[PDB]
Design a protein around this ligand. Sequence first.
Ligand SMILES: *[C@@]1(=O)[C]N(C(=O)[C]([C][C]([C])[C])[N]C(=O)O[C]C2=[C][C]=[C][C]=[C]2)[C][C]1[N]C(=O)[C]([C][C]([C])[C])[N]C(=O)O[C]C1=[C][C]=[C][C]=[C]1
Length: 215
Amino acid sequence: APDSVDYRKKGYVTPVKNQGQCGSCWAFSSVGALEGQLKKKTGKLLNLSPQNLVDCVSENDGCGGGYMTNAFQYVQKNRGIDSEDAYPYVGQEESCMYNPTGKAAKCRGYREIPEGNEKALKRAVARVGPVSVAIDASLTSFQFYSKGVYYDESCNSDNLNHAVLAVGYGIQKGNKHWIIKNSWGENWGNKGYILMARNKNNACGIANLASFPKM
Ligand SMILES: *[C@@]1(=O)[C]N(C(=O)[C]([C][C]([C])[C])[N]C(=O)O[C]C2=[C][C]=[C][C]=[C]2)[C][C]1[N]C(=O)[C]([C][C]([C])[C])[N]C(=O)O[C]C1=[C][C]=[C][C]=[C]1
């Protein structure tokens, strides 16, 4: 198995988007998972559409939040999700206007990972790639993160409130961390990324709501 892994230095990760004043982090979490899969599936790295997900997933609440699994299942039942080109992100909820001709990919179900199990999660990243994970990002230390392996004892493992993407895992100055792709902009944290703590007793509840799509 691998100690360090980074799907960024493998071309599996698209540019850091920026959700804006819309609680669509789930849409952005799902999309980034598929994106890494597609790149592995066909070798093509294109930006999938969070907006197709926001508008079209009736099980989710749009900007009011949603679950990645519902978003994955949707892409399966509808046999496809558009690209950003065919479906730009307005950052606001609107009626579903999905275009078949814009379809960039689809998925045949999803796999969920045992709750709290970071090893399973690490194994997922090593084999598959970017996996959608939900975490507690309320802590203002998170909102002011800039450098280093994040860790705060206040973080509540059951206060899952922000969906993000796991694009890797590794180590730094003795600290085994996770590499997280965030959807708050290129100007948040380190170039839109956070090196959250790993192993540290399921820090922030990272391994409780993770799932990747089957392509
Ligand atoms: C995120 O944007 C969307 N959210 C969700 O999708 C969550 C998913 C959890 C699994 C993590 N929704 C949810 O759990 O319930 C919704 C639901 C489910 C089923 C049916 C209907 C509805 C949460 C959203 N993120 C946030 O609220 C976070 C919270 C943190 C600040 C603590 N805010 C955020 O991301 O925005 C701040 C920001 C915005 C722009 C620039 C910088 C910061």
